[PDB]
Amino acid sequence: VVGGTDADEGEWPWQVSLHALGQGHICGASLISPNWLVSAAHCYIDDRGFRYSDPTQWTAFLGLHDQSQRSAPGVQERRLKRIISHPFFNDFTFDYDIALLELEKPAEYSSMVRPICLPDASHVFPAGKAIWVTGWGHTQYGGTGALILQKGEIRVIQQTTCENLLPQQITPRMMCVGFLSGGVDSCQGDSGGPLSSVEADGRIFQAGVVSWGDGCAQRNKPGVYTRLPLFRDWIKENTGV
């Protein structure tokens, strides 16, 4: 996260850190139930150097705050049992960039570990609505990830604006969130993490999944995210959640 600040401990108990063998944190995810996480499909595409699609290569850290202190009280380690990438995911356009991660051992709900609400398939996060993006990604483009979990407030962007800012690159599955001036944005390492929307009752609902962008925090280049309501039914039929 660029232009954010250190989050309070336990402020985002649904934020998950995904590590692959010998790479530490490389993607994020959101806890939606004791057995399931939501993440981005692109995180699990095989590269000719590492089998990212192999679930056994992954470790999920829940209730984590500091990447340099992963054995802290409250932190839970869980193995992955299965990875379900959306059937229509396109590894070139990044369309349908969403995945479901099944844990092997159920997560244990605590003060630091807690699921995020999922919005209904008909709900709409309006343009101009303030949203929170969180993660251990870079705090500047070309930088390093953050040891302490970072949080930043961003704005949902009009779809037509999004389409004009990133010509020929946006589909209905995607949503621009951030600021036209840049300054605050998600960055490398934030992928798969949830957008958090504080709703009318004060409860936080997931508004999207960190996906891609033309750089980080550049002017007129807001971060691009996978929409959540569109996949509410897909999530239910695959997880029961």
Partner: peptide, 14 residues
């Protein structure tokens, strides 16, 4: 200039 926000990122010339 499109890059996923992962590590390592998946990038394209555009």
């Amino acid at each position: 200039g499109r890059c996923t926000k992962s590590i390592p990122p998946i990038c394209f010339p555009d």
